[PDB]
Amino acid sequence: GVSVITPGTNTSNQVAVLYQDVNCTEVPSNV
Amino acid sequence: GYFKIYSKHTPINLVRDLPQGFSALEPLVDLPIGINITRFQTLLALHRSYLTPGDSSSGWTAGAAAYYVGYLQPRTFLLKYNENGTITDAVDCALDPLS
Amino acid sequence: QCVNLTTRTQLPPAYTNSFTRGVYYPDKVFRSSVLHS
Amino acid sequence: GGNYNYLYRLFRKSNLKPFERDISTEIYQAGSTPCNGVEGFNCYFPLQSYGFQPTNGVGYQPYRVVVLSFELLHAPATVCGPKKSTNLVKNKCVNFNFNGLTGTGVLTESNKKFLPFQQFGRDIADTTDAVRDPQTLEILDITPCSFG
Ligand SMILES: *[C@@H]1O[C@H](CO)[C@@H](O[C@@H]2O[C@H](CO)[C@@H](O)[C@H](O)[C@H]2NC(C)=O)[C@H](O)[C@H]1NC(C)=O
Numbered sequence: 666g667v668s669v670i671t672p673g674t675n676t677s678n679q680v681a682v683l684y685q686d687v688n689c690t691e692v693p694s695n696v
Numbered sequence: 697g698y699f700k701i702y703s704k705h706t707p708i709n710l711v712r713d714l715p716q717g718f719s720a721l722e723p724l725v726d727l728p729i730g731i732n733i734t735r736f737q738t739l740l741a742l743h744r745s746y747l748t749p750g751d752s753s754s755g756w757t758a759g760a761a762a763y764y765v766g767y768l769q770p771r772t773f774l775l776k777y778n779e780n781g782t783i784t785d786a787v788d789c790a791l792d793p794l795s
Numbered sequence: 796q797c798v799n800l801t802t803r804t805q806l807p808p809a810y811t812n813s814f815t816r817g818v819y820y821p822d823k824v825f826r827s828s829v830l831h832s
Numbered sequence: 833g834g835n836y837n838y839l840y841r842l843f844r845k846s847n848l849k850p851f852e853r854d855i856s857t858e859i860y861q862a863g864s865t866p867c868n869g870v871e872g873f874n875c876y877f878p879l880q881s882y883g884f885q886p887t888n889g890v891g892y893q894p895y896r897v898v899v900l901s902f903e904l905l906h907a908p909a910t911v912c913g914p915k916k917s918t919n920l921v922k923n924k925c926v927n928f929n930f931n932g933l934t935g936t937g938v939l940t941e942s943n944k945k946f947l948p949f950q951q952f953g954r955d956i957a958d959t960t961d962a963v964r965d966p967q968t969l970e971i972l973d974i975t976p977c978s979f980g
């Protein structure tokens with residue numbers, strides 16, 4: 666699954682993304 | 697087999713490009729044809745010069761013409777309606793993470 | 796009766812950005828403040 | 833005196849394919865001898881003319897014929913019969929059809945304003961709750977028939 670972490674659009678429009686139990690070397694800054 | 701045309705006219709000031717706002721397009725016609733279309737071209741109007749007898753490219757005068765062409769793709773759009781029945785804003789999912 | 800008009804221009808066409816344009820009503824259906832996908 | 837302007841073909845090599853048409857005027861050749869574009873025995877002009885005259889027994893008088901052929905290729909639609917209507921009643925549980933929209937309920941004068949290309953309105957949870965009358969172009973609400 667892919668999850669999106671947001672502080673709320675009434676605070677900011679930045680976003681972070683969680684790729685669930687995927688090794689972070691095969692996803693396709695801060696990794 | 698149908699040919700559908702949608703249109704809109706909007707006033708803007710001196711911008712180099714397409715504006716930043718939002719405007720929906722109301723439908724004009726739904727012609728029942730059944731025609732196989734893969735190419736198209738734009739018609740331009742030229743005026744006759746009267747300063748030469750010939751019909752060649754020197755015999756027609758013209759102004760300046762430019763247009764913008766983009767292509768449609770099957771996407772999913774979330775449309776926010778108004779209380780009068782007017783699409784005031786929208787967003788295209790599969791655009792970014794937040795979208 | 797038709798004319799050769801095309802002059803060869805070396806310049807390519809430019810590219811701009813359609814920010815949010817080209818949205819239409821895909822149905823005669825009416826709506827009132829209903830967020831519709 | 834005879835109306836000799838109505839001709840018909842009386843000789844052809846082979847029967848027509850359906851809906852095929854042949855307006856040529858070549859000299860027919862019955863026998864084996866070639867014709868070379870001149871008449872003669874076994875070389876006949878292929879068109880004859882009805883000489884119609886007003887004192888002809890029935891079955892020799894001219895009849896005009898029109899053959900209508902309805903075809904259905906594979907388009908999206910086309911011409912068809914005409915449509916009728918009735919009298920849009922109000923304030924009574926009724927069984928209605930608005931150019932395709934089939935439903936049941938009480939019809940009532942509205943006070944909403946569609947855009948001038950929208951036919952009917954829908955609710956959240958997607959049920960038809962308003963229509964526009966095609967003939968007079970006025971918006972009418974559709975409320976359900978009392979039940980319980
Ligand atoms: C509509 O016309 C196009 C013509 O390009 C058809 O697409 C193919 O085009 C290539 C390019 O010349 C031809 O080599 C192919 O033979 C065409 N396909 C076919 C199946 O003939 C397209 O098929 C046409 N559409 C319809 C519904 O007839």
Ligand SMILES: *[C@@H]1O[C@H](CO)[C@@H](O[C@@H]2O[C@H](CO)[C@@H](O)[C@H](O)[C@H]2NC(C)=O)[C@H](O)[C@H]1NC(C)=O
Binds near residue numbers: 967968969
């Ligand atoms: C179709 O025809 C009907 C009449 O056959 C039109 O109904 C008229 O509507 C106007 C409203 O502007 C009334 O003032 C008239 O009295 C109506 N006439 C009748 C006989 O009822 C109807 O408007 C026509 N359709 C359109 C789109 O104009």
Ligand SMILES: *[C@@H]1O[C@H](CO)[C@@H](O)[C@H](O)[C@H]1NC(C)=O
Binds near residue numbers: 675676
């Ligand atoms: C939400 O926005 C309103 C007005 O824009 C503001 O008063 C409120 O503090 C905001 N909430 C949060 C959690 O930032």
Ligand SMILES: *[C@@H]1O[C@H](CO)[C@@H](O)[C@H](O)[C@H]1NC(C)=O
Binds near residue numbers: 688689690
């Ligand atoms: C992801 O793969 C690399 C390469 O083998 C490996 O070193 C790493 O440990 C893997 N991730 C986890 C969480 O083990």
Ligand SMILES: *[C@@H]1O[C@H](CO)[C@@H](O)[C@H](O)[C@H]1NC(C)=O
Binds near residue numbers: 778780945
């Ligand atoms: C459309 O909506 C606006 C507010 O968004 C309202 O003021 C107006 O009365 C409405 N109706 C029209 C323009 O017929």
Ligand SMILES: *[C@@H]1O[C@H](CO)[C@@H](O)[C@H](O)[C@H]1NC(C)=O
Binds near residue numbers: 799
């Ligand atoms: C220009 O027009 C002539 C006839 O007037 C024609 O023979 C010629 O092919 C045309 N030029 C081009 C590039 O088509």
